[PDB]
RNA sequence: AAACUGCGAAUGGCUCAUUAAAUCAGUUAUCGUUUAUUUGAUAGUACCUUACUACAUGGAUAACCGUGGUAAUUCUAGAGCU
RNA sequence: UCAUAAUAACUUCUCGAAUCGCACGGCCUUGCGCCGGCGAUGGUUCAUUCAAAUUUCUGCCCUAUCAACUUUCGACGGCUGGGUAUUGGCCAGCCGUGGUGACAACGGGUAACGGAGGGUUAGGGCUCGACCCCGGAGAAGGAGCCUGAGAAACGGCUACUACA
């Protein structure tokens, strides 16, 4: 056929739009840019791998000098 | 303590008793005028109330 | 057999290497937490009395106070004990610990100075290490600086000057967060 | 089974919630509260599936976060809060009030009510006695407890609650000639007048009612909900809960359809 | 029932919370309130037997002068054994329906109940029993009334 | 950031080995018991302790600086602060 | 012998609030003076909700080349206690000798988790159901236990056996 049906949303203000619209549709419309992140498996491996470190896991090179 | 030094703590602990009272009086007095100035600001809003 | 000597008064610690056994004979058969004289250790230790605080075996197992044995024994360590850190509330895991009687088997002793002597140690008692922070409670500050009930303790508080990395602005001041 | 359950599987939810068998595997699982689990109206289901205000789950919990809508005059902050019979939900911003009440087919329906008279409720008492210190008290069907009641008020009656001060303004006795609505069983939505009551020693008595169309029916005492003696205090929905059979239901749908167009 | 004496055991049997040695003497109609023998009525149109009111027996399992209430289902049966001590066995018979063969067959079950010293029950008597709390491993019923024999 | 403390981790998911009045089904009961959480109501410390301060009590510990042991683990010792 | 009230006492014995943050007001003897509004983390008892454990009645395949079974060291019931969140032969003592069965007990087989239900049709039936819904049990095979309202838990611990 030659007819098409969809859904429409009309917002009162741009701030209410940006405050309520979902991220994936915002990326669809192009108003805001996408977030760059690593894969889910890499994130999961990092999170469970860092559970074996105790205190200030941001830098953990202090135990490299124990061997001399 | 690290922030101060031995001599510093020594004088601070050894400070004369009357000086403590003088410092307290000075602090209470300055607080008194600063509070009075806040009351003067309350008088300024009272003047705004009279204007309105 | 290594030695870890500590000075609580000056807040200083040092590690020494000892290879000659006849100097170390007099520590034997003593218990952890006992009193010993450091005179046989050397001329620089004359007039020194030391307290035995702990030690470690060559294999790495720690000593536990209250168990009398020269070998090591298995125990069911519960929560709140010394050499056990549970992974879950109420968890107990079976471990192996060495008795509290000193013997030739151990690798390192740790001990502290009880009474200062006439002579000085070249690298231990000549330095003092600043305490990182000061008291944080209102009662402690009041008793420490010897104030009275009403003296506006708020003004009297240690202040440390902190600065940013390289922004070029003036440093500011930080305070100990009185909680009472 | 090593404790109580915290999940409810879809395809096992009560039928009167009207949930589609497709589009997901789970159900809202309303949280614990003042109303029974079997016969309750979750707020998320009411707002999203009936009013169609929210498209899906994600914004449903965002909607409540502004505290715009309240029930019984008090704000509730859990999305799966069990609402029930006679409960009134008030939204000040739009300016209308709703009451959760059964229709003639046994499910919850939207029912507009006026703001001025939508500020009171009424509920049946479960037991009456004196509590600690000798103070009498009663508890209704919505977990409302009120101390120092009228001594004439007895069990199984119904009492009118102001909902702002919690004072006993008025009450209705449970006797013949009263107007009642059934709240449990298959006879959902009927309205009738109590004819007579006969009791059986040992529990589980039955009561006989009669509809406006000279119909006759019976139900348990635990399922009767008296709302007045005559001229019922609340506003009944369209149809007045008379349950015409399928013959007249089929006659009326074509009759109004042809009349309109 | 026939009991020679009430106190023929190691311990002393008495009703709990019933004060029996009072300095002041007061006469009251109430059973337990005044200090005399205590009894009540279970209900369901069941009348307290006369032997209970003036009897002296002590029983913690009797529905009368006891701490057991009668509540639940009420059953009927045929008595088959009454020759043990303070316990009876009843037999109940019914008919089961087999759908395929369109006819019935008879079946029966056996039940155990506690008998009070107020009643005297012999073989071939009609009885009515009522549910109660567990009194033993396999005793959950109490006799209430014995119908006259044919 | 880290860490102390609070809560959850007994929900979900998989399988049908054992089990023949055992499990289970429909129908009753708890006047024979326990119950996180949610919701609604609800507590004149009479004197102790004239007084201990009520305009408000008292000691540790984490994180942390720095020094170690074992080839080996989400193993740990002793020293100094809060 | 209920809810509740009253009297004479007791207790290694509880609770009756020394917690935390965002909004800025009123009086007068004008002193760091007094009073005063909404919310997080609690707390004694009652009511409610999610429940849980026990518990009344009836209903399960084939087999007699399975006809009597149960009480050594509880098997049926009575009494006095201990233990459990509570009843109860659940356990400890004393005293009676009981309980089920040809109306199929007891035992042996099951290539047996139970139910809602699937396949096949004049009607009556025969057969399947591990498996999307409800209930029960298990985490290689046995036992024991901490924390916690809730576990005899195994993505919790301890010990043995077999693998590793
Ligand atoms: Mg009843
Ligand atoms: Mg199988
Ligand atoms: Mg509460
Ligand atoms: Mg026989
Ligand atoms: Mg099997
Ligand atoms: Mg199945
Ligand atoms: Mg299942
Ligand atoms: Mg388990
Ligand atoms: Mg296990
Ligand atoms: Mg696993
Ligand atoms: Mg698990």
UniProtKB/Swiss-Prot annotation, chain A:
Keywords: Cytoplasm, Methyltransferase, Ribonucleoprotein, Ribosomal protein, Transferase. The keyword Cytoplasm applies. Coiled coil: none annotated. It is found in: Cytoplasm. Its main location: cytoplasm. One of its GO terms (biological process) is methylation. Residues 37-68 are annotated as: Disordered. One of its GO terms (molecular function) is structural constituent of ribosome. GO terms for cellular component: cytoplasm; ribonucleoprotein complex; ribosome. Residues 40-52 have a biased composition (Basic residues). Disulfide bonds: none annotated. Component of the small ribosomal subunit. Mature ribosomes consist of a small (40S) and a large (60S) subunit. Belongs to the eukaryotic ribosomal protein eS24 family. This is Small ribosomal subunit protein eS24.
């Amino acid at each position: 056929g030659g007819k098409t049906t969809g859904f429409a949303l009309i917002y009162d203000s741009p701030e209410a739009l940006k405050k309520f619209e979902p991220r994936y549709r915002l990326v669809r419309a192009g108003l805001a840019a996408k977030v760059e992140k690593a894969s889910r498996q890499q994130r999961k491996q990092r999170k469970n791998r860092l559970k074996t470190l105790r205190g200030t896991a941001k830098v953990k090179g202090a135990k490299a000098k124990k061997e001399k | 303590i690290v922030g101060a030094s031995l001599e510093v703590i020594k004088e601070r602990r050894s400070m004369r008793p009357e000086a403590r009272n003088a410092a307290r009086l000075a602090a209470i007095k300055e607080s008194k005028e600063k509070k009075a100035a806040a009351q003067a600001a309350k008088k300024a809003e009272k003047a705004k109330n009279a204007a309105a | 057999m290594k030695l870890n000597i500590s000075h609580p008064a000056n807040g200083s610690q040092k590690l020494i290497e000892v290879e000659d056994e006849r100097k170390l004979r007099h520590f034997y058969d003593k218990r952890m937490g006992a009193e010993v004289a450091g005179d046989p250790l050397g001329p620089e230790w004359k007039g020194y009395i030391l307290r035995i605080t702990g030690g470690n075996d060559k294999q790495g197992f720690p000593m536990k106070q209250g168990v009398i044995a020269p070998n090591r024994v298995r125990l069911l360590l519960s929560e709140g004990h010394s050499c056990y850190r549970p992974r879950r509330d109420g968890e107990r895991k079976r471990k192996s610990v060495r008795g509290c009687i000193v013997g030739p088997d151990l690798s390192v002793l740790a001990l502290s100075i009880v009474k200062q002597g006439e002579q000085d140690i070249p690298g231990l008692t000549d330095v003092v290490h600043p305490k990182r922070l000061g008291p944080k409670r209102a009662t402690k500050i009041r008793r420490f600086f010897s104030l009275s009930k009403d003296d506006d303790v708020r003004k009297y508080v240690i202040r440390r000057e902190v600065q940013p990395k390289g922004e070029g602005k003036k440093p500011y001041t930080k305070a100990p967060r009185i909680q009472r | 089974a090593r404790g109580p359950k915290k999940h409810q599987k879809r395809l096992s939810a009560p039928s009167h919630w009207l949930l589609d068998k497709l589009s997901g595997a789970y159900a809202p699982r309303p949280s614990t509260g003042p109303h029974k689990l079997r016969d309750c109206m979750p707020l998320i289901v009411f707002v999203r599936n009936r009013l169609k205000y929210a498209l899906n789950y994600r914004e449903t919990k965002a909607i409540m976060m502004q505290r715009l809508v309240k029930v019984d005059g008090k704000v509730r902050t859990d999305i799966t809060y069990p609402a029930g019979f006679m409960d009134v939900i008030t939204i000040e911003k739009t300016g209308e009030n709703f009451r959760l009440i059964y229709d003639t087919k046994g499910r919850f329906t939207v029912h507009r009510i006026t703001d001025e008279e939508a500020k009171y409720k009424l509920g049946k008492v479960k037991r009456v006695q004196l509590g600690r210190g000798g103070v009498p008290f009663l508890v209704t069907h919505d977990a409302r407890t009120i101390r120092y009641p009228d001594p004439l008020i007895k069990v199984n009656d119904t009492v009118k609650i102001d909902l702002e001060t919690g004072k006993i303004t008025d009450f209705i006795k449970f006797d013949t000639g009263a107007l009642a609505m059934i709240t449990g069983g298959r006879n959902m939505g009927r309205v009738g007048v109590i004819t007579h009551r006969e009791r059986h020693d040992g529990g589980f008595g039955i009561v006989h009612l009669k509809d406006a169309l000279d119909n006759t029916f019976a139900t348990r005492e635990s399922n009767v909900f008296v709302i007045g003696s005559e001229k019922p205090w609340i506003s009944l929905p369209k149809g007045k809960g008379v349950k015409l059979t399928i013959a007249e239901e089929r006659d009326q749908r074509r009759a109004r359809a042809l009349a309109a167009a | 029932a026939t009991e020679l004496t009430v106190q023929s055991e190691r311990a002393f049997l008495k009703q709990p919370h019933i004060f029996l040695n009072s300095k002041v003497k007061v006469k009251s109609t109430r059973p337990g309130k005044g200090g005399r023998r205590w009894y009540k009525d279970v209900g369901l149109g069941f009348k307290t037997p006369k032997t209970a009111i003036e009897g002296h027996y002590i029983d913690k399992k009797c529905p009368f002068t006891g701490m057991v209430s009668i509540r639940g289902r009420i059953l009927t049966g045929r008595v088959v054994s009454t020759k043990m001590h303070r316990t009876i066995i009843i037999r109940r018979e019914y008919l089961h329906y087999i759908p395929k063969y369109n006819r019935y067959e008879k079946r029966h079950k056996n039940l155990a109940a506690h008998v009070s010293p107020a009643f005297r029950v012999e073989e071939g008597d009609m009885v009515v029993v009522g549910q109660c709390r567990p009194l033993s491993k396999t005793v959950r019923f109490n006799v209430l009334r014995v119908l006259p024999r044919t």
